[PDB]
Design a protein around this ligand. Structure first.
Ligand SMILES: COC(=O)Nc1ccc2c(c1)OCCc1cc(-c3nncn3-c3ccccc3Cl)sc1-2
Lengths: 989, 121
C-alpha cells in the first residue's frame, strides 16, 4: 500500500550518520555491517562481500557482480535493487536489512515496474493482485490507447517525437487584438536571433525586423539572408541556400526549454505575445534540427503481462436486504437499526425511498425483499442502488454505500453481494449519500452488508442501440420560440420550473435548432421512463456539436447517463484545442471521479492527449498523483497512472527525479514541523544548512525539471539564498541556478516556495480562474493585466508556489525609516520608474489594479491586506494567498497611484478611465458566467470543502447580477464601486 | 451548539485514529514480508550447510560445525526479535481499533441529537 511518511526508515524520519544493516547472504549467513547512511548499494555490497570472507561458507559466494540486493520497503513490498547507484537512505526501507539474491526474471521488465510503481506511489504487483475483472480488463484494454498514442509519436519519426516532447506553447487564436497590434510598429517586431558559434562556444546575435505573422521557418529564412548578404553569392545561389536550409534549423526561447517547432505565426507563440505586450525584445536561439533530434531518445514502448434482454423482464424492481455484519452503536442510546434504500440516477431518485423493518442492533438480520415502484424496463443505464444503515435514537446514518445496478459489461446485477460500507462524512445531515463514491469500501475491516438481487430466467443485459432506436421511433408558435430562447440564455444554476421542464420536453424536436439548450432539455427528461429516455437517446445521437465550454457541463454530477457523456467527449475530441485542454485539465481530471466505470470514453480521450503532448502529460501526471492518498480514487487514479507511465517514454525518468526531490522536501519539512517544532529560527536554519549540504540532498535537489513548469531546468542550488520562511507551517524558499546557456537573457534564478501543511487547491483553482478571466479580457480587446502565478498541489496539503521576481507586498514598500502616508506607494513607483518610463508604469498599475479589483469582487476574495497584495517594479499589481458579503475594494493608496498623484483622486480623467476599465471588465465576465459556473460545478466531486454544494457556487450568481438585466447589472456594479497610517500592526481606535 | 464543539473535537480523534490504524496495518504487512524473507534464509542455510556439516562431521572438525551453528543461532534469534516486534504492534493495533469503535459509538449518540437541534434552531 502507499507509504505513510517520507522517512528514511519506518518510524524514523532520518537515519543516523552511521547505521547497522543486517545482511542476509546467499549461503544462509547473517552479517551485521555498519554503513554510512549516504552509502551507495555498490559500496555496501563491496564492503559486505569483503567482510563475508571472515564468515563460514564464504567459498560458496561468487563475485559481487553475480548478485542483487532485496529488501522490504515502507510500502510493505519486496523491492529488488537493480540500480546500485541508489543510496541506503533513499531506498524506502521498512527495517535496516538487505538480502543478497541472484537476479531472477528479466531486468528490463522488473526495472520498468519499479520505476512505474515509484512514480505512482504504490507497487504495480498490487494491481496484479486485484482479482476484480473490471480492473484486469481496464489494465489490458487501455493498452490500445497507449499503442495508438505511441504510433502517432513515431509517424513522421524525428519531428513527431520532438513535437511530443516540446509541444508549441502557443495562444488560442492567431488573430491578435488591435490594442496589442498597435503596440508593434508597422505591424512588425524586432527579434534577436542568437547562435553559439564554434570554436570556443562564443555567442553571436542577428537582429531582425519582420512581420509578426511570420512562420518560424520564415524567421530562419530572414536570418540566413542576413548572414549570406556579405558572401558575394549570386541571386540564384542565395535563393538555393534558403530553399535547402530554410528548415535545417530550429528556434528556441533563450533560457527556456520552449521550441518553435510548428507552422504557427510568431505572434501566436505565448513567449512572443507576452514580449509584444511588455515591450520587451524577444531573444531566440538558432540551432541545428539535428542538434535537437540527437537529444530525443525513447519510443521503446513494450507491451506488459444465455443472454436475455432487460425490458423483456415484465417485473417491478426487487432487492433483498439480508444481514449486516456488525455496527458500532451504543445500545444504551440506540436500540433499533434499519437499512434505508433508494434507486438513484445521479443525485435524483427514480422512485420513492424504501426502508427495511426496524431491527434490534444486537441482531442486524433483515432477510427481507424490498419493493420499488419502478418497472425493471424503466431502469436507466446509470441507475444505482443507494443504501445506508440508519439508527433510531430521531434518525441518523451510521454507514453508507452505493452500487451500480448494471456492471461495465451492460449486465444487470443479479445474485448475492457483500458491500463494505463507508463512514458518514462530517456534516452529512441526510440519511443517504447518492453524490458519494459508488463502490464497496476497499477497507474490509468495516460494517459489511450482504445483498440479494432477483435472478430472472438467464443473464439480463441492457438493450442495444438498434433496440432503443426502434422503441423510440415507435413511442410551433411565436412566443414559444422567444420562451425557448429565454431558457437557453439562463445560467446553469437558474432553476427551471416543472412547467418549463414540461415545455422543453414538449418542444424537444425544435430544441435541436437551438443546440446550446441540450443541458436544460436533458434535465427535463423523466429518466425513470424508458418511453422518454429512448426518444432522448435518439435526439442525442444526431444532436449537433456544441462548444467545448458548453459540452464540459455535460460531464459534471447532473449528467450521469453514458450517451450524454459520450456526446460531451465527442465535442471535446472534435473542438477542444491543446491550449484549452491544458486550461481546463484540473476540472477534466475531477470529472473522471463521476464516471461509473474505469474504462470509458473520457479516460481514453484524456490519456491519448497526455501521451500525445508532454505539457498535458506532465500536469495530467501531477494532478492524478496528488490525489493518491484519497482511497475513494486511489485505484482508478493508480491504474490510470500505470497506463500513462508505461507509455510516456523517457519522461517517466524525469518524473521519478521530481518525485524523489519532493519526497526529500516533504521529509525535511516534516522534521522541522515535528521534532524540531519548538526550536528557534536560528537553530532550525543551522539544521537546514547541515541537511541540504549532505550528498543525497545535493544529488536529489540539483539538476531536475520544475514541476510547476518543466520548461524550467533547476540546476545547482543557491544554498546562500535558501531559507525556512518565518511564517507558520515552515515554507521553504528554494533558489536554483538556470543551467541554460542563455540563462542570462531570461532568468538567472529559479525561486520556488515549497509549502507542507496547507491545502493548495483553493489557490490553484483561483489562479486558474484569474488566468481565464485575463484570457476573456485580452481576447475581447481589453488590456487588463493579471499575474496567475504558478501553483501546484503535489499531494496531501503539499505543494509549490512560483516566486514572482522583483515583487513586494504593499506592506514591504510602506516599510521602505518606517513612515508611511497613503502617498508612499506612489512615491516608490515614481522612484523605481523615473522619466518617460513613469507614464508606462502608472498605466500598467491602473490596468492590473482594475483587473484585480473586478476579479476579487466577482469571486468574493476577502481578507485583503497590504501584506497579501504585491506590486512588481514595472508597476504591475497582483494578489496572493487565495485559501478562501465581500464588497468592492479600492484603497486611497491605489487611487493616489491611478491618479498620478492628485489631491482629488475621484475628480480626474485617470479615475474616469479606470472606472471605464472596471465596468467593461465586469460586463465581459458576466457574458461568460456559464463558463465560471460550469468550472466550479465540475469541482463539487473533489474533496474541496469550500465547494461541496451548488449553494456554495450561488455567490457568483449574486456578484454578476445574473437574474438582473445587463443595464441593471451595470447599475448594481457602478453602485458597489462608488461606495468604496497609524496602528497598522493590530488595527484599533 | 454545545454538542457541536465536542462532536467536531470527537471527529478529529476519529480521523487520526483511522489514519494511525491504516499505518499499523501496513507495518504488520511489512513485518510478515520481513519474517517470510528471514524464514526463506534458513531454508538457504540448511541447503548449503548440508554438504559442509557432512564433510566436517566426517573429519572431527567440531569447531567449523559450531561456527556454522553460532551464525544460524544468530539468524534464528533475530526471527524471534522480529516476530515479537510484530506481536507488540498487533496488540497496539488491537488497542487502537478498540478505541476507533468507542470514538464511533460516542459519535453515533451525538449525531442524531445534533441533527434534531439544527432543525429546531
Ligand atoms: C521579491 O521579494 C519578495 O518578497 N518576493 C515574494 C515573496 C512572496 C511571494 C512572492 C514573492 O511571489 C508571489 C507568489 C507568492 C505567494 C505566496 C503565498 N501564497 N499563499 C501563501 N503565501 C505565502 C505568504 C507569506 C509567506 C509565505 C507564503 Cl508561501 S508568497 C509569494
Amino acid at each position: 500500500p502507499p507509504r505513510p511518511s517520507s522517512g528514511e526508515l519506518w518510524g524514523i524520519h532520518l537515519m543516523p550518520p552511521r547505521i547497522l544493516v543486517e545482511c542476509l547472504l546467499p549461503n544462509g549467513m547473517i552479517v551485521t555491517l555498519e554503513c554510512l547512511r549516504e552509502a551507495t548499494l555498490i559500496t555496501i555490497k563491496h564492503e559486505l562481500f569483503k567482510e563475508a570472507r571472515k564468515y563460514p561458507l564464504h567459498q560458496l559466494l561468487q563475485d559481487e557482480s553475480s548478485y542483487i540486493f532485496v529488501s522490504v520497503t515502507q510500502e510493505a513490498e519486496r523491492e529488488e535493487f537493480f540500480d546500485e547507484t541508489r543510496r541506503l537512505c533513499d531506498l524506502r526501507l521498512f527495517q535496516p536489512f538487505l538480502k543478497v539474491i541472484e537476479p531472477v526474471g528479466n531486468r528490463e521488465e522488473k526495472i520498468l515496474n519499479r520505476e512505474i510503481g515509484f512514480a505512482i506511489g504504490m507497487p504495480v504487483c498490487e494491481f496484479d493482485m486485484v482479482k476484480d475483472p473490471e480492473v484486469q480488463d481496464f489494465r489490458r484494454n487501455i493498452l490500445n490507447v497507449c499503442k495508438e498514442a505511441v504510433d502517432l509519436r513515431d509517424l513522421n519519426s524525428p519531428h513527431s517525437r520532438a513535437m511530443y516532447v516540446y509541444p508549441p506553447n502557443v495562444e488560442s487564436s492567431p488573430e491578435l487584438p488591435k490594442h496589442i497590434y498597435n503596440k508593434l510598429d508597422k505591424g512588425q517586431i524586432i527579434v534577436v536571433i542568437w547562435v553559439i558559434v564554434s570554436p570556443n562556444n562564443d555567442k553571436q546575435k542577428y537582429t531582425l525586423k519582420i512581420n509578426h505573422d511570420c512562420v518560424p521557418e520564415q524567421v530562419i529564412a530572414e536570418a540566413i539572408r542576413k548572414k549570406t548578404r556579405s558572401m558575394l553569392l549570386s541571386s540564384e545561389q542565395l535563393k538555393l541556400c534558403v530553399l535547402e536550409y530554410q528548415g535545417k534549423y530550429i528556434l528556441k526561447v533563450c533560457g527556456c526549454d520552449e521550441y518553435f517547432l510548428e507552422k504557427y505565426p510568431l505572434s501566436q507563440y505565448k513567449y512572443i505575445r507576452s514580449c509584444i505586450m511588455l515591450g520587451r525584445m524577444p531573444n531566440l536561439m538558432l540551432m541545428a534540427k539535428e542538434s535537437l533530434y540527437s537529444q530525443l531518445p525513447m519510443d521503446c514502448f513494450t507491451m506488459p503481462s444465455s443472454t436475455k434482454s432487460l425490458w423483456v423482464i415484465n417485473s417491478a424492481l426487487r432487492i433483498k436486504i439480508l444481514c449486516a455484519t456488525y455496527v458500532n452503536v451504543n445500545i444504551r442510546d440506540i436500540d433499533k437499526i434499519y437499512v434505508r434504500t433508494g434507486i438513484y440516477h445521479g443525485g435524483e431518485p427514480l422512485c420513492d425511498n424504501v426502508n427495511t423493518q426496524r431491527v434490534p442492533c444486537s441482531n442486524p438480520r433483515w432477510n427481507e425483499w424490498l419493493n420499488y415502484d419502478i418497472y425493471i424496463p424503466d431502469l436507466p443505464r446509470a441507475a444505482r442502488l443507494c443504501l445506508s444503515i440508519c439508527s433510531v435514537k430521531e434518525h441518523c446514518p451510521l454507514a453508507w454505500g452505493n452500487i451500480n445496478l448494471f456492471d461495465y459489461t451492460d449486465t444487470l446485477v443479479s445474485g448475492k453481494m457483500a458491500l463494505n460500507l463507508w463512514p458518514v462524512p462530517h456534516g452529512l445531515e441526510d440519511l443517504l449519500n447518492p453524490i458519494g463514491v459508488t463502490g464497496s469500501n476497499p477497507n474490509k475491516e468495516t460494517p459489511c452488508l450482504e445483498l440479494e438481487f432477483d435472478w430472472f430466467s438467464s443473464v439480463v443485459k441492457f438493450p442495444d442501440m438498434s433496440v432503443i432506436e426502434e422503441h423510440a421511433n415507435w413511442s410551433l408558435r411565436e412566443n414559444d420560440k422567444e420562451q425557448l430562447k429565454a431558457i437557453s440564455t439562463r445560467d446553469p444554476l437558474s432553476e427551471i420550473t416543472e412547467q418549463e421542464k414540461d415545455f422543453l420536453w414538449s418542444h424537444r424536436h425544435y430544441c435541436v435548432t437551438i443546440p446550446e439548450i441540450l443541458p436544460k432539455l436533458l434535465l427535463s427528461v423523466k429518466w425513470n421512463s424508458r418511453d422518454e429516455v429512448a426518444q432522448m437517446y435518439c435526439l442525442v445521437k444526431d444532436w449537433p456539436p456544441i462548444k467545448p465550454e458548453q459540452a464540459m457541463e455535460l460531464l459534471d454530477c447532473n449528467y450521469p447517463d453514458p450517451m450524454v457523456r459520450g456526446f460531451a467527449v465527442r465535442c471535446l475530441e472534435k473542438y477542444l484545442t491543446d491550449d484549452k485542454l491544458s486550461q481546463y485539465l484540473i476540472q477534466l481530471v475531477q470529472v473522471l471521479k463521476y464516471e461509473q466505470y474505469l474504462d470509458n470514453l473520457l479516460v481514453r480521450f484524456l490519456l491519448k492527449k497526455a501521451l500525445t503532448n508532454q505539457r498535458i502529460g506532465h500536469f495530467f501526471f501531477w494532478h492524478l498523483k496528488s490525489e493518491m492518498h484519497n482511497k475513494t480514487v486511489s485505484q482508478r487514479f493508480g491504474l490510470l497512472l500505470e497506463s500513462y507511465c508505461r507509455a510516456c517514454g523517457m519522461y517517466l525518468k524525469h518524473l521519478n527525479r521530481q518525485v524523489e526531490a519532493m519526497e526529500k522536501l516533504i521529509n525535511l519539512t516534516d522534521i522541522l514541523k515535528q521534532e524540531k517544532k519548538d526550536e528557534t529560527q536560528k537553530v532550525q536554519m543551522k539544521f537546514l544548512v547541515e541537511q541540504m549540504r549532505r550528498p543525497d540532498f545535493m544529488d536529489a535537489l540539483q539538476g531536475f525539471l520544475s514541476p510547476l513548469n518543466p520548461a524550467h531546468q533547476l540546476g545547482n542550488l543557491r544554498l546562500e539564498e535558501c531559507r525556512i520562511m518565518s511564517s507558520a507551517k515552515r515554507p521553504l524558499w528554494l533558489n536554483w541556478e538556470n543551467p541554460d546557456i542563455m540563462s542570462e537573457l531570461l532568468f538567472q534564478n529559479n525561486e520556488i516556495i515549497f509549502k507542507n501543511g496547507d491545502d493548495l487547491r483553493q489557490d490553484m483553482l483561483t489562479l486558474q480562474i484569474i488566468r481565464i478571466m485575463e484570457n476573456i479580457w485580452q481576447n475581447q480587446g481589453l488590456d487588463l493585466r493579471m499575474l496567475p502565478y504558478g501553483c501546484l498541489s503535489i499531494g496531501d496539503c503539499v505543494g509549490l508556489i512560483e516566486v514572482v521576481r522583483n515583487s513586494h507586498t504593499i506592506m514591504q514598500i510602506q516599510c521602505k525609516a518606517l513612515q508611511f502616508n497613503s502617498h508612499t506607494l506612489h512615491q516608490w513607483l515614481k522612484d523605481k520608474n523615473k522619466g518617460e518610463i513613469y507614464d508606462a508604469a502608472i498605466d500598467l498599475f491602473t490596468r492590473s489594479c482594475a483587473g484585480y479589483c473586478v476579479a476579487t469582487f466577482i469571486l468574493g476574495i476577502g481578507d485583503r491586506h497590504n501584506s497579501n497584495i504585491m506590486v512588481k517594479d514595472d508597476g504591475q499589481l497582483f494578489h496572493i494567498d487565495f485559501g478562501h458579503r465581500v464588497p468592492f475594494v479600492l484603497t486611497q493608496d491605489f487611487l493616489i497611484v491611478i491618479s498620478k498623484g492628485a489631491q482629488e483622486c475621484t475628480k480626474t480623467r485617470e479615475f474616469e478611465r479606470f472606472q471605464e476599465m472596471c465596468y467593461k471588465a465586469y460586463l465581459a465576465i458576466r457574458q461568460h458566467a456559464n463558463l465560471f459556473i460550469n468550472l466550479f460545478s465540475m469541482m463539487l466531486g473533489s474533496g474541496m470543502p469550500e465547494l461541496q454544494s451548488f449553494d456554495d457556487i450561488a455567490y457568483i450568481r449574486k456578484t454578476l447580477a445574473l437574474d438582473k438585466t445587463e443595464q441593471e447589472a451595470l447599475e448594481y456594479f457602478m453602485k458597489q464601486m462608488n461606495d468604496a497610517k497609524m496602528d497598522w500592526i493590530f488595527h484599533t481606535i | 451548539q454545545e454538542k457541536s464543539r465536542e462532536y467536531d473535537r470527537l471527529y478529529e480523534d476519529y480521523t487520526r485514529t483511522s489514519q494511525e490504524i491504516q499505518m499499523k496495518r501496513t507495518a504488520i504487512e511489512a513485518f510478515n514480508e520481513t519474517i517470510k524473507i528471514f524464514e526463506e534464509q534458513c531454508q538457504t542455510q540448511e541447503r548449503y550447510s548440508k554438504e559442509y556439516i557432512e564433510k566436517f562431521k566426517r573429519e572431527g572438525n567440531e569447531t567449523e560445525i559450531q561456527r556454522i551453528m553460532h551464525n544460524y543461532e544468530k539468524l534464528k534469534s533475530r526471527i524471534s526479535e522480529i516476530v515479537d516486534s510484530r506481536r507488540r504492534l498487533e496488540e497496539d493495533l488491537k488497542k487502537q481499533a478498540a478505541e476507533y469503535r468507542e470514538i464511533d459509538k460516542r459519535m453515533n449518540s451525538i449525531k442524531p441529537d445534533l441533527i434534531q437541534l439544527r432543525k429546531t434552531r
